[model samples]
Target chain A: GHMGTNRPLVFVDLDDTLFQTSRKMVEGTPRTTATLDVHGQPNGYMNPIQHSFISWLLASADVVPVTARDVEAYSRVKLPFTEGAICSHGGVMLHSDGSLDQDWHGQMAKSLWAFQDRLPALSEATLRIGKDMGYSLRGWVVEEEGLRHYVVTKQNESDDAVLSKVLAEVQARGMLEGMHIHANGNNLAFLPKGLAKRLAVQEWLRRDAKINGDRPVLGFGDSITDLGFMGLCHMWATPARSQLAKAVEEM
Target chain B: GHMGTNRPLVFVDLDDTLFQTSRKMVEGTPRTTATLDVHGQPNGYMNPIQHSFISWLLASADVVPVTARDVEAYSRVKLPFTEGAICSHGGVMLHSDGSLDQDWHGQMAKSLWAFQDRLPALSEATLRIGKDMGYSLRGWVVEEEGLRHYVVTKQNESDDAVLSKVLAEVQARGMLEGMHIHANGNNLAFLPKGLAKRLAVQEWLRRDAKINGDRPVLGFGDSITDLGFMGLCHMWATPARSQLAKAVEEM
Candidate 1:
């Protein structure tokens, strides 16, 4: 085994990594031909490189799929996976046997509860900003039992002005905050202060330590969002042409 | 500057990452802290982290200090540097000043023309092995002027029977491949193969058309042997690590 093969656990981001959104796949990569969205319908495909990488990863470690995809969405992915799954940006995880983990949700609920009270006001303000930016807006709360867990807002894939408008409004609020804002393409997430993918990664690291001992940790990713969680790896790999790399490129 | 700071260049590699020789550090990094060689003054050390990462890189998107450090002995320790400085592994580099570069080679020439011609037989052996492990060992010839650039045998860093036996058989031949059969700690390099360090890592994108483009190239290395040119960068970093992360640990 080489350097990375020693790591028993690996964190792999799903979207734009193991698979790409089709249009983003390089033109001459010898495409995999089949593409599918979370619904399992035709929607996207992985390039030859990513295919080989995922296979290599499968043959090597207890790969954990870390991503913003909720479990329902991530489950529809066609890869053969049987390890822990950290989903919805730290909102939940599935055990290695691929079953729901509710105990984590208990702790998750408590934290979400602490921030639950601000949802009404933040949601109202966010909705207003989206409308002001001339975009249709939708909002929702994700839950377990009757407890609140996630608050999110999505609008048309508007321009930067839309994001800037929301930012200006937050800055104008002139005070400390409740829900933190995050934008990834057309989606806008107003998450509780502590909800994070890295948190989920930390949880996995703790559990894995007890189970795997001092096995090295390696991570692979393709976005800025992925960096936060993947940096936890002993050796981290990112798609050489990833958005994060693009963002770091020279002017 | 959100992350790598508008990307100028990057320097990387260190004992393990950077500042490895300092016992004045962490607890159970379990990585190397000290190891002595024929000279006995700690031939190497490794740190728990690669220092000067984002900050130093931003400060020098245009660094050059790639090496095999012939000028300094590396044990020279305490000092500071700016711009570039390629040493030992091959030749010295201009300090980013675009100067004649020859002035930097204060002590490099003494070794350049030494052990100059095992190349005739070594070259013949390299060819047969190239014909045999043509695919097994994927390395090459390097030269500048009338001298042997650098000799190398391509092999992994795992074992001896794999390579040490090859060198041992030579020792048994008693005909002297001459000078020595140096293990150099832990690399499987053979001589008179003529190797070059400036391959323009400046050495990638051969397979990924998408990975080329405007990405500001950066290299991370820890040792002199690590700099086989190759970097046409925005910055280059030496983890200031005395050796590769492997050979050091458990101090």
Candidate 2:
């Protein structure tokens, strides 16, 4: 049941929070959707308990589905309510009234332009360093969010050690600023700072609803990157046994 | 000053929240130590204001410094007060009275043993895939308490599809059951399930003398991993730029 009485707006993270997706989703295959039932099919998606809980949440609060999925990917997943949605690490914001907000997207693009300009040089350097170290090198690919992101998969190598080395090389070349790198599963990512999921969520909340007051916001997720948006909420929830849940529970 | 005399027990994330080590630290040089004025060093370090806030937290509340740093690295950090501490995610707990609590560690180890045994195979598969894909391999390292745990980096090949792909791979390989991956800065870390900064902080609080149900808990952090622990606190504070502030404000 929903909490009684009118209260402040609440935001929730999708993916592992509302529904559990196959681990394949993290590995880069968009085909992996959450297992909603024991049959392991998308039709069985969304456990009854979760469906009821979400239904209640939508009925009672201002529900916003915040996810890292790009606009098209996010749209494919169906949510019960007609609340606002933020996608593409904030690159795309869809209002409840079925309108698109691109102002923040423009700002983020401007913020990432400097990094884009240097990506070519950095990519060349990364390839050189990988070759010299006898490590494999992956090419660079740019996201619509304006940052040129590249992947580096390790071959019989330690991910942390390789990342540490790459970071070292990046620093040695004086390319530390305006760029960031993250490793999830088995891959590493190099991109600009402004393209974070948390920033995107905040931009949507601030610019769209103007619901900026002393209300307690609740955020839910199952991953580490979700920390940024969850940290901003008054209350935060995550899947049981999740790293995010464990971290929040311990603190 | 103390939330109207409530004096909530404040929990804080250490790295990138209260203090950040130099990029040089990530460069894999031998351990070096230096001290600077409260203003911090030129390459970016914690300043007095940050230090003071933490000191005040220690003085006024049940302060717990939750970090991903392992026990050994955690030991290297000297705090202003004597309070309960947790390291290696929740693998080890150091009490304020100078006693070691390994109960959680034992439990975690038992749970992780199965996964540890599988890691070697996983590492092999990861390497094979990286080589087949022509990507550089990075290693996985997680620092907690006083020791660093090593593993294989799953995805390091392409940034565009890395997050989803790596996550999927880890799951497809049945690695998600016992292991958790965290992408921070330029590195990806493969850690045991149930062993994270949040769980460690909770373990510390459960055994802490200065904290109890009678006293409200407060939490502060800069990353998404901190979301779990932040959720349990009576009050939570994330860095200003963090969406936590904006999200809570909306709530």
Candidate 3:
């Protein structure tokens, strides 16, 4: 079992799994800032239980974050995730030195360009639909290292139902061909077919096996979208009252 | 959080998560017997990874087992689960002293009796259908403390497909009214509508809150059916390559 070296690898999802805004925090509990805002102010906070959970995880394992955040957004997180990171919903993979994984980047460059070309049109259509429905929508194409990634359209003032309707309309018009849709809360993303957290984690496992003797892996997340990568690990966890947990209860 | 009394509460499923028969064991790895056969022979085995996980869980948490096994079947398992247990698919709840939780038992006794009245007929019909389909099916109504819990039908000579077909036919005949079906691998059980691992675990959490001051909870299992109870915990885990893991990958 490699004795002292084979510590369990924990691939954890950020955002709702580990922290959320102060609005969601339980009253009277001491709060810790988990991430910084774009302006470098506290934006994400964790309760006492989450703080303890993170402490335990950091002490016990090699923690790697598998997140939807781009590399720039990931820089704002307060945790010490030095093992490696999967960012931009798997559009980007960074090494421990925080340099781009050239192999993965080169492999994805061509395939993503085609999908990137379609993002402008999809984003336009999505925002137009939102305006037609009397809502303010924000849309953007996320990029890393000069390579275009996925398209995100969000309605900040309304519930996700408003965005889901736009997604359905976009799908009906065939604007989302060759892409997968991820909708949670007020955000919706159109990612290229082959780009996913699971694929990146699988790649990481191959590299890990070479160095770590196939150490056991564990995954943690709060959303159903995280299931793909979580399934690849020897064991996986979801926070209580999470999107994944709610879905399981409904099952 | 309390300084010393707040170890996490782990409600874990037994069979596929912790151990399996030797046929499923990984080759060349050291094996540990996890459970005894009815005759007191070693029947369930754990691989090295699973053994390590169990050791970690026992050392860190108040371990409780939420299982489908009857009380007698549960006694055959050889782990140190001293906190509490939910058995017979929530038909039985046992206290730390190994005596039945009378409060929960009294709540379930009358409800289980009405379902018990219908078990003999259901078992007879299940067996008759299996014979008609040219299969040898074993059917039984599991009992604990003179109360019938659920009806289980199995075909040891074949896979679960045989039992599922019988289940469908039984449901088609309206014989399974007010019942829920749980089919996994080689066994199919017809449980009364209100009987579930989640329900019992929820009850246990109430008792736990009174005594332990609302400590964080964790649940682990390997099947889709286990999701209900797992959802109730502060965190939940599933083993890799398990039924639940396979389903997550397919998602």
| Candidate that scores best on lDDT | 3
Q: What value does DockQ give for candidate 3?
A: 0.47
Candidate 3 off by > 4 Å: A1-6, A23-31, A95-134, A172-174, A245-251, B1-4, B23-31, B95-125, B172-174, B245-251
Which tens-of-lDDT digit does each residue in B121-228 have in candidate 3?
Answer: 788878888899898889898888678888888897757678878877788889988988888788788888878998899999888887776667889999888988
Over A81-159, each residue of candidate 3 has an lDDT whose tens digit, in order, gives 7787999998789998788899999877866876666777777878888899898889988888678888898887757
Give DockQ for candidates 1 onward, in order: 0.04, 0.02, 0.47
User: Model 2: runs farther than 4 Å from truth?
Assistant: A1-251, B1-7, B23-44, B97-99, B123-132, B140-165, B172-174, B209-213, B242-251
Model 3 chain A: weakest 10-residue lDDT segment is A1-10
| lDDT score, candidate 2 | 0.57
Model 3 chain B: worst 10 consecutive residues (lDDT sum)? B1-10
B1-251: candidate 1 lDDT, tens digit per residue: 12222323343432333344434356555444333444656644443222223233324344344444333343242224455444434344434443424532333344545555654556456535544643244343334334444444545534334455555654565534433322443334443222234432222222123432333444565443443332343222232123422222211
Off by over 4 Å in 1: A1-6, A26-29, A33-35, A137-139, A142-147, A157-161, A174-176, B1-15, B22-42, B45-198, B203-251
lDDT for B86 in candidate 3 is 96
Clash count for candidate 1 is: 42
DockQ of 2: 0.02
- Candidate 3 residue B52 Cα shift, in angstroms, is 3.0
lDDT by residue (tens digit), candidate 1, A107-146: 7887777766666666677777668767777776654445
Cα lDDT of all candidates, in order? 0.52, 0.57, 0.84
